[PDB]
Ligand binder design. Structure first.
Ligand SMILES: CCC(CC)O[C@@H]1C=C(C(=O)O)C[C@H](N)[C@@H]1NC(C)=O
Ligand SMILES: CCC(CC)O[C@@H]1C=C(C(=O)O)C[C@H](N)[C@@H]1NC(C)=O
Ligand SMILES: CCC(CC)O[C@@H]1C=C(C(=O)O)C[C@H](N)[C@@H]1NC(C)=O
Ligand SMILES: CCC(CC)O[C@@H]1C=C(C(=O)O)C[C@H](N)[C@@H]1NC(C)=O
Ligand SMILES: CC(=O)N[C@@H]1[C@@H](O)[C@H](O)[C@@H](CO)O[C@H]1O
Ligand SMILES: CC(=O)N[C@@H]1[C@@H](O)[C@H](O)[C@@H](CO)O[C@H]1O
Ligand SMILES: CC(=O)N[C@@H]1[C@@H](O)[C@H](O)[C@@H](CO)O[C@H]1O
Ligand SMILES: CC(=O)N[C@@H]1[C@@H](O)[C@H](O)[C@@H](CO)O[C@H]1O
Ligand SMILES: [Ca+2]
Ligand SMILES: [Ca+2]
Ligand SMILES: [Ca+2]
Ligand SMILES: [Ca+2]
Lengths: 390, 390, 390, 390
């Protein structure tokens, strides 16, 4: 019955402690577990949940054949409580979706699920368990969205969407809803820039997003959104690249405005502003989706700094990672007067890196704390290949 | 503690967006999923649920042998939340039933389940999880009902029942209950007409139903029911047939009063009044239960019109469909001042079309929206035959 | 927060309509379902539940080997909602038990589970999910209880227990509890009589029980209990036997006071008083646990009557039955001003009648209605033997 | 919305009645059940739950290979209701953990899960389903905690932690939290003493703990903690040893202050103060983790007594036992004016005692009652080896 404010500042944190780990793929060796992608977390005032995409198929079953396309007619968004595996019998249905975002305004859950044909996809907004509004593709080229938590401030929820080429100039938009109804939108002017799969969080009454340039950028785009949908758009200032693939730190020069690095492709990732500093997540490998570390760059939010002051390893470089994204703990759960910054790391198993017929992932979730946390590796741990691969 | 009014008008909609898809049969390749028929949807003020019939058997098990008769002593009505698969461990028991209808009056769930012998079946009304009243066969020939959501207006719930031949003159009745107790009934006078498996919804304080003629009609009967159980009965005026099998549109002349088409058999289907227009669902094939499209015929509710102004494809003609039925979103969930029109499409897999020992189905659920939605096909997607078929 | 009165009269009913059927054994062919006995029903103001005994073993698993003794250290009482199968993932734990009874006082659930050695068993009373009190064997010979719903009137709950020989004079006691604490007990004086496995229900502010004589009686003992624990004890007056095994009706003379029939063994069963009439359940076969019918004998509660005025078949004589027991619907669920009489019928599959290594059962539940209901057979339906038997 | 006082005295009990038994390993033969350790119980005002450690693996699956180390990156704390098996589809995620404790303050659940590298582990405190605070290793040698219920008194919760050698002098600390935030801590001075895996309970407004000396003691350390974190520390006075391994009773002399017995190793166990008497749990074997009995030693809490006045066997010496720990029933559930003393007994199956590739355990839970309870054995009961072992 009450909207979450989410107007607070992000907590200044010295490190990240383990929240949860689902072990979904290990369990899936025998249990009944969805083949998934993007196990992103979002929290209501009472609990955090892991959302994920399914193909309607289970681990160790013929339907887990990974030849089916990502944007299939079978693709749905579902969810479970954080730390639970994406198993069938604990799962809540959310939306038909091959692209998704989701957030809670303090009263109910809002989800957006994109489905339909690439040429004219439909984004169906769900609020409180029923469809409430719709967004059709405005540019006829794979309407898509964050694949992480959206952001609700004082009852209104915001998210970023892209429509157009995945490797050249696309079009980018900010949408705003209240109670599952669209109340505003704004086109993001970003000539020469590329925005994909934004990882957002609230901070000081604004929505801050760290996204993925899939065009020429090895640094991450940053978009700061005000409630009237005026915005600031650019790149993460830091003189260290955090996309994948990327070049070496020493061969990089940062920019607050422009993409640097001259490389294609990318991986969904996140970053958290800490005053003027930044925490930036990245895969350990410069070239592959293996390992995951997080770095604190002093003045990295505002300057082309290379002054690294913290580093914490969460998945070693001997293990596969994947997508990563941001969310915050509601003050109603943390009991703090700031917004605890949190992230999930997806850990991809199977194709193409390993010899299976399938690909899935599991997650480790970490939350920002007031203390330095030691390095370690909470990797997926499943033993490949599986019975079905034989 | 409060009855749903459901006195509003049906929303005028330009198209239908995907609500949910369960992927039950794909999941059933490995998971523990009921073999089902008729995954019909009905909503309470807090959630929508998929109801379905079971035989007590699971996909990929010997008991899924489809030699067992529909009207078996094992047949039960169960339910899950919309988008969930009809799996064992999320299922709620409802009623012993080989024919069913179900609706929520705003306080509790009412279900009617028909079981017993063809010569003298018993319809047991359940309210709030216990049997409350009973209807015995009045004509000794397979007492049966809607296989879709019933309809509650201001606390009283209504439904249509048939008793008699499935291919000649039968008898048709309207029943009315409050709190699971029969409070009224009326015989439907329809000489030369045939009523089966009505798909109803509320509109303007009346219950409107689009049914199935299984006698000689390729157009659908329409029954409009007032709370005092006076009624209007006839056929969907539109000069386009929507039953299956049917002839071609060009070879058809509509009628508001009489069955046209001169063909036997049929398939459960639905239609929504839009002022004087209609949305009519139908299989794409004229002869088989494959594909599903919905058409808007201008003035089709009141005139023998052939003026098609909209068409949306939801399951292509390369894929199996089946039953379809109507329900509405409560205003308490939609947040609208009208009754959002919604439908589910059952997608039948296995016998007789495919070489398996079993038959089941899955669903796609769609809800009316204020925008045109692109064609696509959210088909079942299961890969037949299964392990058990070998 | 409110005690159920349960002071009303039992509804006069003309027949019994199907409430629920779990299909547990059919589902267990593939699903994860407890091997059970005694699927007895009891209702709280919000729902009815099926309770049952487990051995910690699942259908189609080696542990379902039926060589394990009934009174094992593994035996537990668990429960699910009525109509659900006794599956692992929907089950609620209740008590360690190889004999049980259970009832809800309107605020919480009370269960009594008997376990321990035959020479000195312990009956642990559970209230609201924790042990609250205890009853040790008073006669050192298999302390045991109803295996059906106990009975709560105005907050105090009553049940019948036996301790001693199963084929000669035993000792019988009535216990009374409030909030899981023993507040009273009474020895039942019944020289020459035998009381086992009572099926009780409330009626007119008293607890009426129809039990099993396992000594020499083919008619059923009847015990009527007042809240001060004064009681009346005897036999069901009717001149028709309802135990199994029994002789033929024509060879029987009834008695209100004494056992007739001169045969050993028995089967748990039930009966409902209707003014002075009775509804009596019994297996169809005189010698085996097959079939189930219910008969109304005019004046059968008070006279040695043979005047049968109703008969309804619920499981034909081609199918296995088993235990049966009584319970009532709370007025808070039925919405009636009387106590709707209800019964469950257990349907035993496997050993000794069939060639399997295991034995389990499933249930059909029926509730009294104001109308005559047609005969039919809602039998178990599982296809024996199973994979494990091969 | 209300804190539990837990200031009462422990109930004086004459024996222990069975609360629950999960049969997890028997069920796991076919069902989907976590491979676990330490099924410890803790209660909120509404229910008791079994907590347990998992490796992300299921019984009868290759991942159950017991070669994985206890302190793995996969190890998580999860929980179910008491008596339920640690199955996947009923499980609630709690914390990433290879060591754990958990308790409810009356408003919410607090859990502490230790994970990370031995050299610098991190203990993450969870309150109400999110991380709230952190404790890093203060001595760089396997930070660890109780593996049983912690203890909440008047809203503040306390627990004991160890950091250092498992076979020589370590360091021991008491921590105190409110609402998941550390509010106090104290170093335990215990030169020559060893504290591991404390089993605590509240009594008279203090926290009493009976722990495990893994250094030279066959008697158990006792630590009594006051809310200001002043404490009393020593050994269980009784002239009978209760650790495992241990020597014979006749060869033992007790001490209130010092470890006796001169043997290494140990097993988690418990004890309950009864005025000046004690109930002490122990394995029946002096050398192995088989059997479980509980003894009442008159004046054993305060004197080097050998006066055994009660003994109750719960698992015979023909069956495997394992860890044991203490918890109490809230007065809000028991309805008593004292704190009912309760314990769980873990029953370990598989390696090293039996020829399997895996090790798991199941539990029997017992609660103190006002009556003598007969000996019996509620052992695990699973039939080894399993399919996977072949
Ligand atoms: C369409 C743009 C979207 C976001 C960059 O791209 C996705 C990213 C993916 C990726 O980074 O691997 C995989 C998705 N299947 C999709 N596919 C491709 C080929 O780009
Ligand atoms: C009895 C009338 C009812 C509704 C037309 O018929 C049902 C329709 C069905 C159908 O349309 O296929 C299948 C049902 N098994 C049932 N059977 C037959 C043979 O008609
Ligand atoms: C001990 C008395 C109790 C109730 C008559 O008996 C039970 C009845 C049973 C029965 O009627 O088959 C089976 C139970 N396993 C138990 N066993 C025997 C041999 O009598
Ligand atoms: C590290 C101290 C902790 C508590 C004594 O020890 C544990 C006890 C265990 C035990 O008693 O068997 C097993 C745990 N895997 C761990 N391992 C060892 C080798 O001691
Ligand atoms: C393991 C497996 O069967 N994988 C299938 C393969 O058989 C099939 O040839 C291919 C498409 O034809 O899709 C994939
Ligand atoms: C796959 C399978 O076994 N199908 C069965 C068949 O074996 C049996 O002959 C028939 C009735 O006899 O019912 C069906
Ligand atoms: C199907 C099966 O294995 N049944 C077992 C049998 O093997 C064993 O001989 C007997 C006791 O020894 O218990 C039963
Ligand atoms: C039953 C089984 O496979 N156990 C495995 C074994 O195969 C393997 O050799 C070992 C480590 O190499 O781990 C264990
Ligand atoms: Ca890039
Ligand atoms: Ca027709
Ligand atoms: Ca008898
Ligand atoms: Ca020791």
């Amino acid at each position: 019955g009450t909207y979450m404010n989410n107007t607070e500042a992000i907590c200044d944190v010295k490190g990240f402690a383990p929240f949860s780990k689902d072990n979904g793929i290990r369990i899936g060796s025998r249990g009944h577990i969805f083949v998934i992608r993007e196990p992103f977390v979002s929290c209501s005032p009472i609990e955090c949940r892991t959302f994920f995409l399914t193909q309607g198929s289970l681990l160790n079953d013929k339907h887990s054949n990974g030849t089916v396309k990502d944007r299939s007619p079978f693709r749905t968004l579902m969810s479970v409580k954080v730390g639970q595996s994406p198993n069938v019998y604990q799962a809540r249905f959310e939306a038909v979706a091959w692209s998704a975002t989701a957030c809670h305004d303090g009263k109910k859950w809002m989800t957006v699920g994109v489905t339909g044909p690439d040429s004219k996809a439909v984004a169906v907004i769900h609020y409180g368990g029923v469809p409430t509004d719709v967004i059709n593709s405005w540019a006829g080229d794979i309407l898509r969205t964050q694949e992480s938590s959206c952001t609700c401030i004082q009852g209104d929820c915001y998210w970023v969407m892209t429509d157009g080429p995945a490797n050249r100039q696309a079009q980018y938009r900010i949408y705003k809803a209240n109670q599952g109804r669209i109340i505003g939108q704004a086109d993001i002017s970003f000539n020469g820039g590329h925005i994909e799969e934004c990882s957002c969080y609230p901070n000081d009454g604004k929505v801050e997003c760290v996204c993925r340039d899939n065009w020429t950028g090895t640094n991450r785009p940053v978009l700061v959104i005000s409630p009237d949908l005026s915005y600031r758009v650019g790149y993460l200032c830091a003189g260290i690249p955090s996309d994948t693939p990327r070049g070496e730190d020493a061969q990089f020069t940062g920019s607050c405005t422009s993409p640097m690095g001259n490389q294609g492709y990318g991986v969904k990732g996140f970053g958290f502003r800490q005053g003027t500093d930044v925490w930036m997540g990245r895969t350990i490998s410069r070239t592959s989706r293996s390992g995951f570390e997080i770095l604190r760059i002093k003045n990295g939010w505002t300057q082309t700094s290379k002054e690294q002051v913290r580093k914490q390893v969460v998945v070693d470089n001997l293990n596969w990672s994947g997508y990563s994204g941001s969310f915050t703990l509601p003050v109603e759960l943390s009991g703090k007067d700031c917004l605890v910054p949190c992230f999930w790391v997806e850990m991809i198993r199977g194709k193409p890196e390993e010899k299976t017929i399938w690909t899935s992932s599991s997650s480790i979730v970490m939350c920002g704390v007031d203390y330095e946390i030691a390095d370690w590796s909470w990797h997926d741990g499943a033993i490949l290949p599986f019975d079905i691969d034989k």
